[PDB]
């Protein structure tokens, strides 16, 4: 029994280590929340390479899809990975040439999710609004899922908030794969929405907040 392990309240903690246009930094984080109602939160702390000279916007979605609500007719597959976990990896393309690449492996140890992040965004102009701090949030978004080759695809077209206006778009791919072979869904839709409840004036101490669920995109 899956849900004997993955419980509806679960604990994490996540260690990042990245490069942005070069400048190197890592992040340790808690968080905690309700797998089965899509809900969570995180709190973060830079502890390399503070304070950082770039947007908080473009690692935020980077700290969860074990805590993604699923109807019961589809395959709740990352939750089905555990014990073992998964890993996933991911592309972010935005709009002004910027690039940011992600791997990441989700684990589960003493009855906590362990996340371990690799993040590298490059090509970001240094008058652009991440290397400038212009973005003000992400924009709720709908993250596309299909199973391909054995692992769950994601595809998204993710926009943040500008502050003089308007947006700054990215497009997205993500791969999840369970370390084990376990059901994988057919083609749906995860409803997402990522707030920072809280940071200080430097973004080296955020907080974070997240819901997501999954929907029906035929049938239901």
């Not at 899956?2 to 942005?20: Q, T």
């Not at 990441?104 to 996340?115: A, C, H, R, T, V």
């Not at 596309?144 to 502050?163: F, H, S, T, V």
């Amino acid at each position: 029994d899956n849900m004997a392990i993955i419980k509806e309240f679960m604990r994490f903690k996540v260690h990042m280590e990245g490069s942005v246009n070069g400048h190197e930094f890592e992040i340790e984080g808690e968080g905690e929340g309700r797998p089965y109602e899509g809900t969570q939160t995180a709190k973060l702390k830079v502890t390399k390479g503070g304070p950082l000279p770039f947007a908080w916007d473009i690692l935020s979605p980077q700290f969860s899809k074990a805590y993604v609500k699923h109807p019961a007719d589809i395959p709740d597959y990352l939750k089905l990975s555990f014990p073992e976990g998964f890993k996933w990896e991911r592309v972010m393309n935005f709009e002004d040439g910027g690039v940011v690449t992600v791997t990441q492996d989700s684990s589960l140890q003493d009855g906590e999710f362990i996340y371990k992040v690799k993040l590298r965004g490059t090509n970001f102009p240094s008058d652009g609004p991440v290397m400038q701090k212009k973005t003000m949030g992400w924009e709720a978004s709908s993250e596309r899922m299909y199973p391909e080759d054995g692992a769950l695809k994601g595809e998204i077209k993710q926009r943040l908030k500008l502050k003089d206006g308007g947006h700054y778009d990215a497009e997205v791919k993500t791969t999840y794969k369970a370390k084990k072979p376990v059901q994988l869904p057919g083609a749906y839709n995860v409803n997402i929405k990522l707030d920072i409840t809280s940071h200080n004036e430097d973004y080296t101490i955020v907080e974070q907040y997240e819901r997501a669920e999954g929907r029906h995109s035929t049938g239901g």
